Amino acid sequence: MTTITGVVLAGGKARAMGGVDKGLLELNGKPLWQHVADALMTQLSHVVVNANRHQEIYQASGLKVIEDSLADYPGPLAGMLSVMQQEAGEWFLFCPCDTPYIPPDLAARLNHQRKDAPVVWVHDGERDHPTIALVNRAIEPLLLEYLQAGERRVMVFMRLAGGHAVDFSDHKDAFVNVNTPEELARWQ
Ligand SMILES: [Li+]
């Protein structure tokens, strides 16, 4: 009953009993993934989170937590597909859990600039962010086919799907990401 579902991508795997759970690192007292979720909720009514570890902790703020399928596909596309398989509705705006400053016109600008493409993603003037992406339902079968073929590459898929980058170079620093605890410490 809303047009785009927001999705925080809080990682998959735990390919050695985890290591740092990046989405749960706290920035000014608030988990990174919750900064992203709050920024999506500014612009969208329905927001969910894809998380595969510490699910009870992710569930604490009252959002639906979606876990990856048993297929255990590699990389960020696996979480995208698991979310499309477990949520109805025609459009999704994905964003990783480590980019806490995403802007309140993310959804609106990606939608304005979609120009008939089934997928668009953010370019920040320096680099593509192909996991910050507005994706139509139609992508679901293509994603399933690509991951079943054993592929993982995100940009390659976005290209195969007929997507394009949307220019957010004027949004100074809204797309900085926290790569490590070492980096997080600097933004406090
Ligand atoms: Li642990």
Say how far apart CA 126 and CA 129 lie, in whole Å: 10
CA distances from 126 to 10, 76, 123, 131, 168 (A): 24, 21, 7, 15, 10
Which experimental technique did the depositors report for determining this structure?
X-ray
Nearest Cα residue to 97 out of 145, 53, 56 = 53
- Kindly give the distance from the C-alpha atom of residue 16 to the centroid of ligand 1, in angstroms, as a whole number: 10
CB 77 within 8 A of CB 89: no
75 CA → ligand 1 middle, Å: 21
Q: Alpha carbon of 84 to those of 58, 163, 164: distances in Å? A: 19, 17, 20
3-class secondary structure, 6: strand
Q: How far is the CA of 40 from the centre of ligand 1 (A)?
A: 27
The two three-digit tokens of residue 169, written as one number: 């170079």
Resolution of the entry in angstroms: 1.6
Mind giving me the DSSP string for 105-130?
THHHHHHHT-TT-SEEEEE-SS-EEE
For 1-188, the fitting CATH number among 3.40.190.10, 3.40.718.10, 3.40.50.720, 3.90.550.10 is: 3.90.550.10
Q: Write the burial class of residue 63 (CB in 10 Å: 0-12 exposed, 13-18 middle, 19+ buried).
A: buried
**Ligand 1 centroid – CA 1 distance (Å):** 37
Amino acid identity for residue 185 in this structure:
A
At a CB cut-off of 8 Å and minimum separation 6, what does 96 contact? 8, 9, 10, 36, 76, 131, 132, 177
Q: Is 84 exposed, middle or buried (0-12, 13-18, 19+ CB in 10 A)?
A: buried
